[PDB]
Design a protein around this ligand. Structure first.
Ligand SMILES: [Ca+2]
Ligand SMILES: [K+]
Ligand SMILES: [K+]
Ligand SMILES: [K+]
Length: 133
RNA sequence: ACAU
DNA sequence: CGATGT
């Protein structure tokens, strides 16, 4: 229906898919960048979106914030709900770094709790997510 | 088909 | 036009 303005929005950016992956989280209302991940040399769009949501969860928990997280990624939202990132990216020395981060993000989800609602950004109705690149 |  | 996903 309507945007929950008191929220954190995340977004992935990439150069290639697979290719260089980065992500950031922003205040949905103001656009203020709240966190930005150093670019990861090789990963997929969906791994980046997954890592972005999990980082937002950890960021909000550490700050005792009950704000929801918006993501436009059907895939990543489901991976977080499942606590399992079902990526097809091969595992090799080239992809070790992103797979390490993804493996660690799943481990974190399996060892911590949170009530943070994870919400679908309705691009069709609201336009591009505010964390856009 | 939908979400990227 | 290609790729990542449910
Ligand atoms: Ca975007
Ligand atoms: K996105
Ligand atoms: K983007
Ligand atoms: K497809």
């Amino acid at each position: 229906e309507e945007i929950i303005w008191e929220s954190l929005s995340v977004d992935v950016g990439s150069q290639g898919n697979p290719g260089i992956v980065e992500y950031k989280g922003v205040d949905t209302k103001t656009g203020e960048v709240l966190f930005e991940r150093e670019p990861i040399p090789i990963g997929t769009n969906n791994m980046g979106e997954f890592l972005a949501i999990v980082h937002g969860l950890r960021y909000l928990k550490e700050r005792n914030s009950r704000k929801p997280i918006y993501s436009d990624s059907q895939t990543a939202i489901k991976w977080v709900k499942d606590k399992k990132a079902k990526s097809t990216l091969v595992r090799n020395e080239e992809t070790a770094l992103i797979w390490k981060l993804v493996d660690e993000a799943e481990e974190w989800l399996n060892t911590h709790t949170y009530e943070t609602p994870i919400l679908k950004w309705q691009t069709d109705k609201w336009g591009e997510i505010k964390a856009d690149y």
